[PDB]
Amino acid sequence: SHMCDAFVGTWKLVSSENFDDYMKEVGVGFATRKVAGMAKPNMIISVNGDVITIKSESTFKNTEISFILGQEFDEVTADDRKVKSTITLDGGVLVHVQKWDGKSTTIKRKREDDKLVVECVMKGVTSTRVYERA
Ligand SMILES: O=c1cc(CNc2ccc(Cl)cc2)[nH]c2nc(-c3ccccc3)nn12
């Protein structure tokens, strides 16, 4: 048993707050915001050795990242940003930092009760997305 055991599984989006405003702050254009905001993604987390895989499957866009904690990787986000990402575990929270064009956003993922809570921060704007087991 290891580092991310309580994250592993298939999760379904059950609530969202402020996501449109977060996407605006990131620089996502109107049409992409509208379609991405409608999505109800399933997020699938798995671990094999030191490699963590996070897949996001939705009607908008299927994405997949695999990574080792602390080790930078290149990521193409669902809104088509080309970013440099680093994911670490900080006090039991997965902290995912994306850097591009001189900008930075942080996505935190944590277990709280039977939920997986995702907090997306770009400058002063936070969006909270709550997932439950599928
Ligand atoms: O709902 C979101 C939103 C973001 C923020 N990235 C993002 C940026 C641009 C767009 Cl257009 C869409 C998404 N990251 C994120 N990770 C997970 C998640 C949930 C459960 C298990 C594993 C991962 N959900 N979630």
Swiss-Prot record:
Positions of post-translational Phosphoserine modification = 15
Q: Give residues annotated as binding a fatty acid.
A: 129-131
Q: Which cysteines are joined by disulfide bonds?
A: none
Q: What is its main location?
A: cytoplasm
Where does the protein end up? Cytoplasm; Nucleus
* Residue numbers covered by motif Nuclear localization signal: 24-34
Q: Any idea which UniProt keywords this protein has?
A: Acetylation, Cytoplasm, Lipid-binding, Nucleus, Phosphoprotein, Transport
**Which residues are recorded with the post-translational modification Phosphotyrosine?**
22
**Which CDD domains does this chain map to?**
FABP4
Give the highest taxon in the source lineage: Eukaryota
Keyword Phosphoprotein listed? The answer is yes
Q: Does the keyword Nucleus apply?
A: yes
Which PROSITE patterns does the entry link to?
A: FABP
- Quaternary structure? Monomer. Homodimer. Interacts with PPARG.
Family, per the entry? Belongs to the calycin superfamily. Fatty-acid binding protein (FABP) family.
What this chain does, per the entry, is described as:
Lipid transport protein in adipocytes. Binds both long chain fatty acids and retinoic acid. Delivers long-chain fatty acids and retinoic acid to their cognate receptors in the nucleus.
Its domain description in UniProt is: Forms a beta-barrel structure that accommodates hydrophobic ligands in its interior.
Query: What is the protein name stated in its UniProt record?
Result: Fatty acid-binding protein, adipocyte
Q: Which gene encodes it?
A: FABP4
